[PDB]
Amino acid sequence: RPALYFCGSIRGGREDRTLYERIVSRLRRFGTVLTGDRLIHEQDLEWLQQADVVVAEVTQPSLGVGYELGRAVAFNKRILCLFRPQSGRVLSAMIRGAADGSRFQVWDYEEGEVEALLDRYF
Amino acid sequence: RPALYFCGSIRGGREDRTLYERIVSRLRRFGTVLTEHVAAAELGARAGGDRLIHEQDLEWLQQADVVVAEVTQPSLGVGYELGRAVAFNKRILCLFRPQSGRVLSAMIRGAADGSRFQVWDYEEGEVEALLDRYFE
Ligand SMILES: CN(CCc1ccc(-c2ccccc2)cc1)c1nc(CN2CCc3ccc(C(=O)O)cc3C2)cs1
Ligand SMILES: CN(CCc1ccc(-c2ccccc2)cc1)c1nc(CN2CCc3ccc(C(=O)O)cc3C2)cs1
Numbered sequence: 001r002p003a004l005y006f007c008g009s010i011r012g013g014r015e016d017r018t019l020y021e022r023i024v025s026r027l028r029r030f031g032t033v034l035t036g037d038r039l040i041h042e043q044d045l046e047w048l049q050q051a052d053v054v055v056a057e058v059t060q061p062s063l064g065v066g067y068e069l070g071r072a073v074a075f076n077k078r079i080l081c082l083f084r085p086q087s088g089r090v091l092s093a094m095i096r097g098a099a100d101g102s103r104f105q106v107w108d109y110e111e112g113e114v115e116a117l118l119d120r121y122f
Numbered sequence: 123r124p125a126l127y128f129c130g131s132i133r134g135g136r137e138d139r140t141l142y143e144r145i146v147s148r149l150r151r152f153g154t155v156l157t158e159h160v161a162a163a164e165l166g167a168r169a170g171g172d173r174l175i176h177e178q179d180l181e182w183l184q185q186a187d188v189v190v191a192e193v194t195q196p197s198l199g200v201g202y203e204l205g206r207a208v209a210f211n212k213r214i215l216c217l218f219r220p221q222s223g224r225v226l227s228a229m230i231r232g233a234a235d236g237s238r239f240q241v242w243d244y245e246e247g248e249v250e251a252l253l254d255r256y257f258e
Binding site: 009010037038039040041042058060061062063065066068069070072073074091092093094095097099 | 131201203207210229234
């Protein structure tokens, strides 16, 4: 069983919060979900370094989610980003452009299929 | 000259056009601002549009001696750049405006170690004076 790191925006809306709960609930089927400002950073970074997969919900813009993704890239982690185009947002070119289709994947999704996409990934 | 990299949110770009312009103009006093212009033959020498932007931005980031980030507007792109910059062992300065009413992400505020990664709350009027102090 892999160690799984989930990230999402601390400022996510009602739709985002229900989706984060759904993503985390489904990730439990595959492995262990690991998830003072300095203390928060150090603890989250320790979890990120131990992760086998980093799964980020990137629909809401967030400095923290972007930061965890940049650190995860440099930690050589396998990354899956999930973006909901029905939010009307445009995903940052830095995240869409980070994708290489293998160790860094960015998938658009409709809210109803998020568990089926996670099953496909694992 | 020291190679300086400046980043800010793309979505704030029109509203914050003048503020990012003031930071960049003051950074010019202390080094070459790598991020001010993109040479087209460099992009041609290098992929879809987003990938091209990611690659050019990562080339600027690795060339940098100092990374200056305006972190007032939440952005996945700016956070990603800061994450990659930390791992490249870059000296980083983040500038945040508490007058915006926002709470800066604990991941950015908590990343500060006092020397190679600094986060400074500022009022817009002192931004040039703050850049002078950092670069002295
Ligand atoms: C369910 N969820 C996404 C929603 C969420 C829940 C909790 C906190 C959190 C904040 C502070 C301290 C502890 C937890 C932050 C976001 C998760 N995300 C993660 C990973 N990190 C945790 C840290 C962090 C900090 C800032 C920001 C940001 O948007 O700027 C994002 C994150 C995300 C763990 S659980
Ligand atoms: C003045 N300024 C902040 C506003 C700005 C200006 C230019 C472009 C840009 C876009 C594409 C190609 C080149 C430059 C992007 C944002 C600067 N920022 C930087 C660094 N990168 C460039 C890339 C990038 C992409 C997305 C996002 C995001 O907020 O999601 C942020 C950034 C920031 C260079 S000049």
